[PDB]
PDB file of C-alpha atoms and ligand atoms in Angstrom:
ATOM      1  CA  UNK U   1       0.000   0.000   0.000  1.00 29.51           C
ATOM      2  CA  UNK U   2       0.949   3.508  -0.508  1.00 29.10           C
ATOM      3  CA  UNK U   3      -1.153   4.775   2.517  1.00 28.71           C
ATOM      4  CA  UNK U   4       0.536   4.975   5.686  1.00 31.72           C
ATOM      5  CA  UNK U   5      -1.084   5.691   8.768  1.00 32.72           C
ATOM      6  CA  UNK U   6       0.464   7.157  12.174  1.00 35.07           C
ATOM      7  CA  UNK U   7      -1.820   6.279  15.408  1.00 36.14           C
ATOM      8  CA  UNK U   8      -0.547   8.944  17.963  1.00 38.31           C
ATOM      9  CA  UNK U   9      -0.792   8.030  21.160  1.00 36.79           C
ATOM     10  CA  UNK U  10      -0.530   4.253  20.299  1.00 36.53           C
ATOM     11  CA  UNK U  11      -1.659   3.832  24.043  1.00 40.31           C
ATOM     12  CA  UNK U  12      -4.476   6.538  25.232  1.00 41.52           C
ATOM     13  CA  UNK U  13      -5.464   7.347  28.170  1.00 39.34           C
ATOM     14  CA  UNK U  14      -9.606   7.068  28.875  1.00 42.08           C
ATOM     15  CA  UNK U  15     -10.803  10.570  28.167  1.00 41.92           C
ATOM     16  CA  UNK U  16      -7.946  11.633  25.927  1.00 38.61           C
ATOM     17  CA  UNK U  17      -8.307  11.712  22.123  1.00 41.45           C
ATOM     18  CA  UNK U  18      -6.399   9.786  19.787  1.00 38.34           C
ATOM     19  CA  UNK U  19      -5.636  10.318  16.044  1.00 41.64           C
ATOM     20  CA  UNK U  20      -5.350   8.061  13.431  1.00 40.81           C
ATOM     21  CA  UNK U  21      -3.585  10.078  11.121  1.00 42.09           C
ATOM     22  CA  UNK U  22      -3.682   9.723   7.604  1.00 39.09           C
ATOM     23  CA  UNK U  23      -0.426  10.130   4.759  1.00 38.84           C
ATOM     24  CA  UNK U  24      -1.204   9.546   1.249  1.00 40.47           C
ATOM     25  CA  UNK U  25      -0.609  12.357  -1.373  1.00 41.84           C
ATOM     26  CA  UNK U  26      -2.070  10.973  -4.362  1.00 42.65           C
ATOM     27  CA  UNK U  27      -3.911  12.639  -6.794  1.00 44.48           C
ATOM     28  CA  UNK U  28      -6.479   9.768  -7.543  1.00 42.59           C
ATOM     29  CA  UNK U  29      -8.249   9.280  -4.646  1.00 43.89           C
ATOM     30  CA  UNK U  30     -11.912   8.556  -4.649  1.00 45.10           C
ATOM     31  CA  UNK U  31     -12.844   8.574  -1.063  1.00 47.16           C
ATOM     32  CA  UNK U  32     -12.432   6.952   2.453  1.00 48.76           C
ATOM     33  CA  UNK U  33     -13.996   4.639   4.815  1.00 47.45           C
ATOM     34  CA  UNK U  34     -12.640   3.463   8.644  1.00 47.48           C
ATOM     35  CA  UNK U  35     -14.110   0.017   9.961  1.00 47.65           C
ATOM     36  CA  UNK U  36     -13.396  -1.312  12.772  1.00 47.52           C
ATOM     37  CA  UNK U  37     -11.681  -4.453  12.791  1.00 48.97           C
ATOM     38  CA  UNK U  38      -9.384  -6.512  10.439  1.00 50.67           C
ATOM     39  CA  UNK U  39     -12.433  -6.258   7.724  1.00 50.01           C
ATOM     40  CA  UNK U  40     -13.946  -4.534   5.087  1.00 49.84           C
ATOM     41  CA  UNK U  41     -17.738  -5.010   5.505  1.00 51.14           C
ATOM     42  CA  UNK U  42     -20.343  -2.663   5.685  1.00 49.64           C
ATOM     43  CA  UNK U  43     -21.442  -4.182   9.303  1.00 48.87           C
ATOM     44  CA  UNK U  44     -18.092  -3.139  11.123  1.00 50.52           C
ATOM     45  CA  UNK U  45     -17.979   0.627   9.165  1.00 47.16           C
ATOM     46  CA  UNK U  46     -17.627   3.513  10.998  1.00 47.88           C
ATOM     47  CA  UNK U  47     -17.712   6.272   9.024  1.00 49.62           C
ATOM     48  CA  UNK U  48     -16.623   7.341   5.360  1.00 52.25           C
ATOM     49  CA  UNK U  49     -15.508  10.838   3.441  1.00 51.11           C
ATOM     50  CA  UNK U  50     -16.189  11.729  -0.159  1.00 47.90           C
ATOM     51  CA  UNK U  51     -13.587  13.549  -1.515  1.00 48.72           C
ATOM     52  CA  UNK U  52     -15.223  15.282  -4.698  1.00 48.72           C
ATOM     53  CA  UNK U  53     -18.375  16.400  -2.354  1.00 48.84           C
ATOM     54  CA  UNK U  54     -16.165  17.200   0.353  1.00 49.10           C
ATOM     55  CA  UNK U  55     -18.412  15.013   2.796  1.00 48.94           C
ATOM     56  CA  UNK U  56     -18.782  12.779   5.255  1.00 51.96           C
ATOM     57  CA  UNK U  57     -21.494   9.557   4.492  1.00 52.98           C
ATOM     58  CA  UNK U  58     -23.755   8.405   6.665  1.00 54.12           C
ATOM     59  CA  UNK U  59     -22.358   6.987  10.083  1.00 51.84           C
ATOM     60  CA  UNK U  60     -22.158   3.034  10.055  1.00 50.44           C
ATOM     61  CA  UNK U  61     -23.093   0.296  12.262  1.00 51.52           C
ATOM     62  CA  UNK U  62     -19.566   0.767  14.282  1.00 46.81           C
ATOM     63  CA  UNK U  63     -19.876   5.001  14.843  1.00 47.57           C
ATOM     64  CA  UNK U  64     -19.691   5.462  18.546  1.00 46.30           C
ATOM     65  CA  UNK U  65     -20.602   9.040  18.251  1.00 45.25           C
ATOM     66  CA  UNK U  66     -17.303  10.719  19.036  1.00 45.80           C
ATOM     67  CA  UNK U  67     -15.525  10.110  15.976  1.00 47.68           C
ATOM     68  CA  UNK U  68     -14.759  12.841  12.945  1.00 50.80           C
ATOM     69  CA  UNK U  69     -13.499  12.421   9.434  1.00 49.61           C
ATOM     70  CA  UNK U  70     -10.912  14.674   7.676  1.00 50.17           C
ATOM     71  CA  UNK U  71     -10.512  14.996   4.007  1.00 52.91           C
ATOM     72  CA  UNK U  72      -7.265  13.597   4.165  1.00 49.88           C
ATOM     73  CA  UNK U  73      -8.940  10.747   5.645  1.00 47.30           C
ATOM     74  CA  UNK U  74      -7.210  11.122   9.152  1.00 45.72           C
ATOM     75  CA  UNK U  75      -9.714   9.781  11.773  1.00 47.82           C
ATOM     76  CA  UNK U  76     -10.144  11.753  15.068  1.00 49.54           C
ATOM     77  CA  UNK U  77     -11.662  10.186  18.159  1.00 47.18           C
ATOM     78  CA  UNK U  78     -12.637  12.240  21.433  1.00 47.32           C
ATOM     79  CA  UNK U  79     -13.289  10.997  24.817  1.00 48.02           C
ATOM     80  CA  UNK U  80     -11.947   7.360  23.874  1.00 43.75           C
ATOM     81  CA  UNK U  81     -13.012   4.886  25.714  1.00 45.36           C
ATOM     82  CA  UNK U  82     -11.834   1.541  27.067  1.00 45.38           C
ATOM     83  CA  UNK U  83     -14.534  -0.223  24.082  1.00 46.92           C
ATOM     84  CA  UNK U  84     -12.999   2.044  21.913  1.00 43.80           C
ATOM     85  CA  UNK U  85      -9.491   0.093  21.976  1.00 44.50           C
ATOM     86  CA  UNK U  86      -8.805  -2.469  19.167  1.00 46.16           C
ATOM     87  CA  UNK U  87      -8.054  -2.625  15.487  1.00 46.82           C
ATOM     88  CA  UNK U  88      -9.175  -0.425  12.880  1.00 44.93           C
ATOM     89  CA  UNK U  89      -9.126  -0.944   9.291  1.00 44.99           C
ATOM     90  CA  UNK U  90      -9.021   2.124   6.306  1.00 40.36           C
ATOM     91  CA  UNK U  91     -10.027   1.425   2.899  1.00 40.07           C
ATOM     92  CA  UNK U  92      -8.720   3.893   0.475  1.00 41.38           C
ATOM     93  CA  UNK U  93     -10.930   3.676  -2.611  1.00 41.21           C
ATOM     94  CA  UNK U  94      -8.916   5.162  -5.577  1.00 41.83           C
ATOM     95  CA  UNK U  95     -10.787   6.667  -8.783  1.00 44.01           C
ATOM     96  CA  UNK U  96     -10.060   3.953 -10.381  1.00 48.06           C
ATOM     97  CA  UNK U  97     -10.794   0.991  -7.876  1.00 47.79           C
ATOM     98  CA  UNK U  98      -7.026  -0.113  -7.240  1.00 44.65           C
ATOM     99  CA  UNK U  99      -8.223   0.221  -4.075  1.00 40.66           C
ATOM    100  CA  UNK U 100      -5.894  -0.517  -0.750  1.00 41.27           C
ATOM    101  CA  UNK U 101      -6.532  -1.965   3.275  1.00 40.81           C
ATOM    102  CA  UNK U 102      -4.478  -0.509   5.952  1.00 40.03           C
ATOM    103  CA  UNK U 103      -5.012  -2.158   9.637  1.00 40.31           C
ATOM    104  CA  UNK U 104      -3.696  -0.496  12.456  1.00 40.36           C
ATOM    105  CA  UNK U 105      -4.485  -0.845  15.902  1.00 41.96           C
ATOM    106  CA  UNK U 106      -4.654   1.141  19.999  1.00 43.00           C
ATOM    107  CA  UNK U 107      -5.304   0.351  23.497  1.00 41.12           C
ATOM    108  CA  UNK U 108      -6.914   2.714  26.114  1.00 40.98           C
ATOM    109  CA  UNK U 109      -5.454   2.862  29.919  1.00 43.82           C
TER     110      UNK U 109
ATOM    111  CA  UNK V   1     -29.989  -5.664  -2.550  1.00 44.36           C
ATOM    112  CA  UNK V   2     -27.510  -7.015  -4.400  1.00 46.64           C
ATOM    113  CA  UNK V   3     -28.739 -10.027  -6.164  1.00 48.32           C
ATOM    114  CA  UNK V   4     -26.295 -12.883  -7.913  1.00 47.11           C
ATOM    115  CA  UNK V   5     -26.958 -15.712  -9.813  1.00 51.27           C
ATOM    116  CA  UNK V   6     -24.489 -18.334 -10.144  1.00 49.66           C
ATOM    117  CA  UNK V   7     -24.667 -20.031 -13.658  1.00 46.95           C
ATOM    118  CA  UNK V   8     -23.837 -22.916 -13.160  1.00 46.94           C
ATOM    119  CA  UNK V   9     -23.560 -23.770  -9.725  1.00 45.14           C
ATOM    120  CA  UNK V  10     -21.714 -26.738 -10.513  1.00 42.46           C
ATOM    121  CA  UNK V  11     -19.187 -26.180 -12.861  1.00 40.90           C
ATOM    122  CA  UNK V  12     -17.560 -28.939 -15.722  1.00 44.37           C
ATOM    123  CA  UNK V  13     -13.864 -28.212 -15.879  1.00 44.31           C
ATOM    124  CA  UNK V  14     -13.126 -26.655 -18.891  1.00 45.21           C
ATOM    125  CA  UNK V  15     -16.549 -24.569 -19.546  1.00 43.25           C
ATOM    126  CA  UNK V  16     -17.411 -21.526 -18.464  1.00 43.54           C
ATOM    127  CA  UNK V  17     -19.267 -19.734 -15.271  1.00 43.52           C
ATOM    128  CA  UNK V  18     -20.957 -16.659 -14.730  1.00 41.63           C
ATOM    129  CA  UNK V  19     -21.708 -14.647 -11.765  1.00 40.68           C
ATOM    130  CA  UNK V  20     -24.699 -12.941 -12.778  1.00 37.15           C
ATOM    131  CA  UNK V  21     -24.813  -9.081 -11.157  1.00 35.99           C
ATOM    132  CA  UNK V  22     -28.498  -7.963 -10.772  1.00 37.79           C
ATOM    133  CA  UNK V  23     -28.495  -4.368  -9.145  1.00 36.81           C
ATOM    134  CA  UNK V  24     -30.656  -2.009 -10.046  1.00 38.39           C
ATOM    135  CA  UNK V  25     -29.420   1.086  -8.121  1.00 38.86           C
ATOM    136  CA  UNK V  26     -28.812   4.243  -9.650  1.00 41.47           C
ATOM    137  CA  UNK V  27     -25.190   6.111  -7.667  1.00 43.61           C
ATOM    138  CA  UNK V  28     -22.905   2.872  -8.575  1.00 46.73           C
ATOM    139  CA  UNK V  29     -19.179   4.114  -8.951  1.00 48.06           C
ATOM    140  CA  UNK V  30     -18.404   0.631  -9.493  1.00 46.18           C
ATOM    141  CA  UNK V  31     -16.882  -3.222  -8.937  1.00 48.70           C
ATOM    142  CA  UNK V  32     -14.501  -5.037  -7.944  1.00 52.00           C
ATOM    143  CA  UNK V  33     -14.559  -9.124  -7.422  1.00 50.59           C
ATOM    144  CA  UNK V  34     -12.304 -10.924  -5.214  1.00 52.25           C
ATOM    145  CA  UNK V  35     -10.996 -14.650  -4.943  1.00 50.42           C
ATOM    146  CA  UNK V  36     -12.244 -15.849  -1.222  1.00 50.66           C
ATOM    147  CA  UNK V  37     -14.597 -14.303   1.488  1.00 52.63           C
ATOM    148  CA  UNK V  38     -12.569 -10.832   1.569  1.00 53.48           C
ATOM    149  CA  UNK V  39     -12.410  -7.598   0.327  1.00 55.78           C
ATOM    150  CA  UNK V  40      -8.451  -7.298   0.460  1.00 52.72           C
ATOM    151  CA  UNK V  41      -6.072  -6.064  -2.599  1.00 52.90           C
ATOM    152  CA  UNK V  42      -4.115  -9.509  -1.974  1.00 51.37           C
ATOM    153  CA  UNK V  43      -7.065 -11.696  -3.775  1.00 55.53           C
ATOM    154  CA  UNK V  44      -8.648  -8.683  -6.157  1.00 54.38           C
ATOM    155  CA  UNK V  45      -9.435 -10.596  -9.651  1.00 53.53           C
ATOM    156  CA  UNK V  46     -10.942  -7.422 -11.862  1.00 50.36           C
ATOM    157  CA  UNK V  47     -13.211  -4.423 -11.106  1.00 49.86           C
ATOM    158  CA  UNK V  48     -15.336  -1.963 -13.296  1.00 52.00           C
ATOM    159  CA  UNK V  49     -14.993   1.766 -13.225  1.00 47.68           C
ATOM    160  CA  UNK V  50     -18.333   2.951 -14.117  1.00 47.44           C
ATOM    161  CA  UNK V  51     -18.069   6.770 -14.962  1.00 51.07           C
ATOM    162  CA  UNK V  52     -15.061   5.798 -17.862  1.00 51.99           C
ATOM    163  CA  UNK V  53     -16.897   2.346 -18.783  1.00 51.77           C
ATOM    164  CA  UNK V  54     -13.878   0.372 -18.457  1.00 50.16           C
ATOM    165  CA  UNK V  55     -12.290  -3.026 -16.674  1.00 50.92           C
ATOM    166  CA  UNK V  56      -9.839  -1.476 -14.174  1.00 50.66           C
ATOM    167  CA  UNK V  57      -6.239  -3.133 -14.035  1.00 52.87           C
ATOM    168  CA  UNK V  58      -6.049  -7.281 -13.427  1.00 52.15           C
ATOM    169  CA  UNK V  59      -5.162  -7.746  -9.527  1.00 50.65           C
ATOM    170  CA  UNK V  60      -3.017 -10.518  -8.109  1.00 54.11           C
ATOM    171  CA  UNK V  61      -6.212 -12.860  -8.416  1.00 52.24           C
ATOM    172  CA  UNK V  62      -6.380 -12.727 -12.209  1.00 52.73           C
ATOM    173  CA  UNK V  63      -5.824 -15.487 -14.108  1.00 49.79           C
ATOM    174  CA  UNK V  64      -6.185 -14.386 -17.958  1.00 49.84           C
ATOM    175  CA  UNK V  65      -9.537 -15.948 -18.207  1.00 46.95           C
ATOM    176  CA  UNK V  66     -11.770 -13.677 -16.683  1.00 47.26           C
ATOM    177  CA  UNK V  67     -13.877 -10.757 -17.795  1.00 49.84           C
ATOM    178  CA  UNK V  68     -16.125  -8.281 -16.124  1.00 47.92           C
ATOM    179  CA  UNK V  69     -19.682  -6.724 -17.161  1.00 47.91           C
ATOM    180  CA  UNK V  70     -20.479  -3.075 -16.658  1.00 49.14           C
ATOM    181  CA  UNK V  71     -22.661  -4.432 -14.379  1.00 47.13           C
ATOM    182  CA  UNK V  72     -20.348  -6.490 -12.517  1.00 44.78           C
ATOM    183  CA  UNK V  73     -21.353  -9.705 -13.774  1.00 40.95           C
ATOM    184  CA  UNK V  74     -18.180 -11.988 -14.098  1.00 39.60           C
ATOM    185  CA  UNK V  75     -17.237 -14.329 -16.767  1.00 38.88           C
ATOM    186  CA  UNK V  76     -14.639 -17.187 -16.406  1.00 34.95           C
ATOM    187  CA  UNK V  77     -13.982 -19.347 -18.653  1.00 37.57           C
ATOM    188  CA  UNK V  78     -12.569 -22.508 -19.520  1.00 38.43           C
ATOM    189  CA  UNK V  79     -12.359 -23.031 -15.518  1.00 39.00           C
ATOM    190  CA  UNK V  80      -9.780 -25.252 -13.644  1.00 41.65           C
ATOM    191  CA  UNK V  81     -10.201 -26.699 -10.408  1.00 38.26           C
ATOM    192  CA  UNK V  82      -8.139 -24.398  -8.840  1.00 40.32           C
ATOM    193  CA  UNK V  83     -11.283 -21.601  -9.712  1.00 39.63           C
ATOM    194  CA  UNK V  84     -13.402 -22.874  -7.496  1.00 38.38           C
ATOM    195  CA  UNK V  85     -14.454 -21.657  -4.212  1.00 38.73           C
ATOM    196  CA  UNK V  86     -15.351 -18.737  -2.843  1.00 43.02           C
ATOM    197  CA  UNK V  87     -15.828 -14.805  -4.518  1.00 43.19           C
ATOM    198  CA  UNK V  88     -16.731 -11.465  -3.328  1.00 41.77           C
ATOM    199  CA  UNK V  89     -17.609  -8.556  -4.851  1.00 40.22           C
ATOM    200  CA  UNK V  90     -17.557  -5.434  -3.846  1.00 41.45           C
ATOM    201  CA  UNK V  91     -20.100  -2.876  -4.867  1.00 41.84           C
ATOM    202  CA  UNK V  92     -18.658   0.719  -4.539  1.00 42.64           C
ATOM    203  CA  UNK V  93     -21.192   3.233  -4.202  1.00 44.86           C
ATOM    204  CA  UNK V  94     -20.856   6.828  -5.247  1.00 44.32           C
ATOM    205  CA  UNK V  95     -21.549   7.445  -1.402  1.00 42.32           C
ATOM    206  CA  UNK V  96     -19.143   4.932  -0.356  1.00 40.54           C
ATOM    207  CA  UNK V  97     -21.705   3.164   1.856  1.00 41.09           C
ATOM    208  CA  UNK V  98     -20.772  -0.191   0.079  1.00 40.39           C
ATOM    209  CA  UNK V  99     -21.795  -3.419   0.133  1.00 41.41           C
ATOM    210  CA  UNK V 100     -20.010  -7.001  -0.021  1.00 38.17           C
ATOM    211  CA  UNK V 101     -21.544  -9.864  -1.606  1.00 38.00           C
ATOM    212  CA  UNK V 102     -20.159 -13.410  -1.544  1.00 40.62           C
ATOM    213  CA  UNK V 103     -20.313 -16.668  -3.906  1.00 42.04           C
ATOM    214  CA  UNK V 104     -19.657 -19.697  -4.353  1.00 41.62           C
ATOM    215  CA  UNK V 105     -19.358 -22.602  -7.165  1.00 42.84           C
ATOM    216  CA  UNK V 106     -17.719 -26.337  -7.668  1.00 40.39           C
ATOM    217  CA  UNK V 107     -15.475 -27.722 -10.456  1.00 39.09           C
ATOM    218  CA  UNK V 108     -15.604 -31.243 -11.166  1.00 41.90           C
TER     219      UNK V 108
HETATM  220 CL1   CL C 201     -11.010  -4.840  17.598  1.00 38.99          CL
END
């Protein structure tokens, strides 16, 4: 993949916010959406950006409510809580649907 | 709501299958089918790119004898064993709320 992603603080404390911060300069890009989990699937989405509209989509099954989507794709999340820990998954859809997965992954003390 | 028809379910080696795409929606961006139960760039086969009606690049998954539809339905043809199993497709929407679909047929 040519996405990286940075997860600053890797451990959080409860309360605290926590980026999941997003590096991919290309040109192409399409649009955004976090899951949580190892997966793809629409029943683990959290929350998706569309980069033409400049928009968010609709929250998904996995939104807890505190989370907010840059155009860059970088995902924010306030107040984390201890539920909140665990692996989340980016898919980077591309313009022209060479698309990529990026996991990454945080705890909560 | 996205419908697919496997024809045939059960597959002679050497003919041909089709995974028949019914979806009627109206914001599609586009397709892409995998090999297995997961959307991941590892198993991608072929995908459709609606707005420039054209197949996208072959992924790792390709084997030279498939071809996609503008609706998504995939073709393979003269099938081996190793074709069977399991695909997914994934149906890009132009609002990126998705949807995964999964498939399966036999060779014999
Ligand atoms: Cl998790």
């Amino acid at each position: 993949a040519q996405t990286n992603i940075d997860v600053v603080p890797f451990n959080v404390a409860e309360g605290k916010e926590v980026l999941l911060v997003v590096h991919n300069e290309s040109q192409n890009l399409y649009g955004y959406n976090w899951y949580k989990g190892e997966r793809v699937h629409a029943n683990y989405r959290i929350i998706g950006y569309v980069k033409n509209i400049s928009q968010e989509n609709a929250p998904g099954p996995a939104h807890n409510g505190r989370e907010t989507i840059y155009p860059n794709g970088t995902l924010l999340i306030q107040n984390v809580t201890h539920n909140d820990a665990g692996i989340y998954t980016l898919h980077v859809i591309k313009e022209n649907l060479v698309n990529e997965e990026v996991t990454r992954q945080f705890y909560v003390f």
